[PDB]
Design a protein around this nucleic acid. Sequence first.
RNA 1: AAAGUUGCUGCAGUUAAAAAGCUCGUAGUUGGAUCU
RNA 2: CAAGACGGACCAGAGCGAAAGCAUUUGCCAAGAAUGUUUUCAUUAAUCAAGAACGAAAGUCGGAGGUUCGAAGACGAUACCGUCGUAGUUCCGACCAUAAACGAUGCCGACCGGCGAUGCGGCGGCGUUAUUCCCAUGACCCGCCGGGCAGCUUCCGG
Lengths: 265, 175, 216, 82
Amino acid sequence: VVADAGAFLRHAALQDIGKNIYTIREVVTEIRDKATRRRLAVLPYELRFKEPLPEYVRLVTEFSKKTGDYPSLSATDIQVLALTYQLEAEFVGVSHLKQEPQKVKVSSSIQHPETPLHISGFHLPGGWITPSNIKQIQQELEVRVGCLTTDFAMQNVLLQMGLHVLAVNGMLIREARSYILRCHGCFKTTSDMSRVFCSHCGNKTLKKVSVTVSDDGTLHMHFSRNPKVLNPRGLRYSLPTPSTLGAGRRRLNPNASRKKFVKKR
Amino acid sequence: EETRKIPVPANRYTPLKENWMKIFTPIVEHLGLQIRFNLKSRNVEIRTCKETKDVSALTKAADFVKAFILGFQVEDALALIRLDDLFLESFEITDVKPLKGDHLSRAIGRIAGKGGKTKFTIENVTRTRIVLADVKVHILGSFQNIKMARTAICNLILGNPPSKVYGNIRAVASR
Amino acid sequence: SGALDVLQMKEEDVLKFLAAGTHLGGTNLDFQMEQYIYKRKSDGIYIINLKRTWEKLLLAARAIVAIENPADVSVISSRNTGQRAVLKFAAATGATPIAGRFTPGTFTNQIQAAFREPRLLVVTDPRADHQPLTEASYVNLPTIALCNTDSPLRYVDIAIPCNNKGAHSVGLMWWMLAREVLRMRGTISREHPWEVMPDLYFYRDPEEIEKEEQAA
Amino acid sequence: PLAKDLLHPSPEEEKRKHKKKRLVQSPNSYFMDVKCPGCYKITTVFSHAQTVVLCVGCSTVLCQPTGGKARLTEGCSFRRKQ
RNA sequence: AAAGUUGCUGCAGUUAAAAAGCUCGUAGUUGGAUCU
RNA sequence: CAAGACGGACCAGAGCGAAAGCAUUUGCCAAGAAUGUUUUCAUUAAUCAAGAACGAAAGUCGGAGGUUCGAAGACGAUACCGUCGUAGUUCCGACCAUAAACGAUGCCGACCGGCGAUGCGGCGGCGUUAUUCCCAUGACCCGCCGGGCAGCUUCCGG
Ligand SMILES: [Zn+2]
């Protein structure tokens, strides 16, 4: 059972269910939350620190750059993936896992990318939120060694490799669906939900595209066949010669009616 | 079981969505109530569940969401949850004197002041919270604090300069 | 440049141009840069015609060859995405580089430790480098610039029409300009490609470099 | 700007311009042969016609006047001239 | 004369003195291109 | 139930009108700008002394009606405020001709940078919708032209 830093951030106390709890030093020494640091000194010390072999870290890097999830994840994510791959290698025979990840299939839809599907607090038609379900609502919820990964990039590459991923709850994950940012200029995807500029081309051109992966290593990723998202309407305006508050004012195009006695900065 | 629905205008859907977490958490952990938001009717419905604590606080929870619909920040509406002597007063600028067109906009700008400064000053003077809509203005506070803030707002829309109202409201707060 | 059957575009050139994402521009257009657009595709991204920027690169290279002294050419970049690149552009020819924050009065205040008198100016980003263009408009200094579609052309004498926001495109175009000036300067020939890979000039993110040496 | 041959504009720019603001002004309209479906005669019809043009032999409605170009009925064929 | 502070040469009329509340309108003033 | 009033929200960087000004439905009347035009006439035009038409609000003469509000005024408190309230506010017919009647900015014509929003008319076009509507049409989308209301930007020049 490999514990990721997201499990430490969410105070996931799963030391009872798993016995092979191993992780790397820099994923636990980079946490900036003081409550996690206080909780780390109370929990029993069954955790062990080790460094993966260079060969396996390298091969993790080649299929990480094959799967297209290369820039989204960091070096600590590489170390976590290498450690869980090594733990799977020296516990179980290595013939179970596979390489050359499957090509992604195309399946468009007419729904808008900002449709609030599978958000718990809303109701599409029933759909009700009780206090008993607050502990239940963490993510999409459905043997010897597992992973306590939280971010979708590591779960995506693990389910692409066929490695069984675990959660804060007892059971494993069968389906994993989320949103990523795809560029429509240079056709490069990024799973970082907070970024606004692209990686390769560098424009402010990323748009929301949904993804869903399974246990078998099959991935399907949905566009939106709505012309509202892809149009250059509010994108050209003359520029003057050279934080999160006031966010909806920027989303208006400048070439539009504002009130006569108000001013944009 | 009791239920209550709060409408959401289209200009408040994105603010409601963005900080929905700190909206549904203080209801389900503190008051023990059971909420949802339907998109077909655009309504936030609150109803009591079995593990309800202090049933005669359901209205308070509704007031919570109601304040956030009017434009108040979630901290001030959470203060509306905690304190019991907190009330909401709403009125229009034209509702006390007929101002048309540019006069109405100048009255709005006099209430706000440069950088919102005048409005912000009144808040720290009166320990209230004021959010003013396109023509509507809403004050959140205790009764006498609402009366003081309403006094300052009514004087600013009379045409009194912001400097005089600033000084007089500081002097009244001193008393 | 001149239809002389030796300075034309090649299939490798267009292939690597489309690989590096140089040809696609921003979302704004300035009316002085309408002649470098091929057309407007419906997605909202202005494409930059490849032969136009090829000829403009050749014109900038002809302007930079014409100076006999490589030491009095200033090459400046304020954004980090070209910063190390212009340093290696110095290793191309010896043109003095300025990377990072630009000191005001570098070109106009003679009582300074850093007071330089170049003869051409080459600029990675006109928007970030507004102060060096302002100071170059005071000392009779001509200007080369790497200009996107959303870039003003004031005090710009040769504007290279390219994507300059992405690291790969700006590093590639610095490498291509260096290859042209070294090709017709006298160092290298045309029968053999330059041994320096384009990826050498590329800016590398610290997040990339903390996991680059992990795969050794 | 500052260098453009006003004597020899590009033809797409001349077709783009207003009909009076060209170098030599010219109309945007044309005359056309119209063939009624119920017959085979030829009728000469202005594109921007304002009157209801009737068939010379069939006495049927050929075009309907509109704010701009005339609307030919369904079934009749047309061919531009010159 | 300075005084381009009487302005034909040669002044002004947003904020300094100053454009009629608006439109029509005879007199007066001015009036497209074209003929060896 | 009745009486008179007034047409909220929609209502805007909107539209129309010579300006003052104009917002419930439907019907009638006659005007009107812009657009489209390989129609017609052929200089019929621009500006205003004299002269004429309209001209917010208040006000004045006569008829009708007075719901609300309300100058003056009568009370009570302290020029401010409250209760009551006359003329007036309302309609019809004549006078008055004044406003910060504002863009504090004559009218007509030509030239002189850019952008994209919007109202109307015209044109061209992939496409989606009237539960994969079985061709057209309305509603959207992209682009162009013309006259507009109105913004942002610029070391055009002043
Ligand atoms: Zn991109």
